[PDB]
Amino acid sequence: SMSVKKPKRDDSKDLALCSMILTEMETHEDAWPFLLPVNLKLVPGYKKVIKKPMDFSTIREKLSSGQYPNLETFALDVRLVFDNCETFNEDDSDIGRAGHNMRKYFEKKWTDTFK
């Protein structure tokens, strides 16, 4: 509260560490469904169903331009990618499996890096 401060995380390396995690996700072999925005003109139903599209290239642009105020907003956008994937794809499809795989991959890097 006012004039009563908690000790807080050293956050000075957060930007660089998130960038490294994102690089590891960008280069994963199962990243291909998530590298670019889904083409809303070519993919029936996506525009109406998925209220907040997100993809790795949009996250990278946002990270490179100071649009994440903290590491938690970065993780929210990453998770949104996989939450969207689950919404639109069956678990046993190729894209569906890729999403589960990439989510697992992310969360381990996230825990190992920050928790």
Ligand X SMILES: CC(=O)c1cccc(O)c1
Element (H, E) at 60: helix 56-64
CA 98 vs CA 37, 67, 102, 114: distances in Å = 16, 27, 6, 24
Residue 33 beta carbon to ligand X: minimum distance, rounded to whole angstroms? 4
Residue 25 beta carbon to ligand X: minimum distance, rounded to whole angstroms? 13
Residue 96 beta carbon to ligand X: minimum distance, rounded to whole angstroms? 9
Phi, psi of 31 (to 5 degrees): -75, -10
Q: How many chain residues touch ligand X (CB under 6 A)?
A: 8
When asked if residue 95 is in the footprint of ligand X (CB under 6 A), the reply is yes
Structure tokens at 52: 């907040």
Q: Which is nearer to ligand X, 14 or 83 (CB)?
A: 83
Q: Which is nearer to ligand X, 59 or 71 (CB)?
A: 59
Selected binder of ligand X within 33, 54, 82, 110 (CB under 6 A): 33
- Amino acid letter for position 33: P
Structure tokens at 26: 């960008």
What is the SS3 assignment for 11? coil
Which residues are near ligand X by CB under 6 A? Answer: 33-34, 38, 43, 85, 88-89, 95
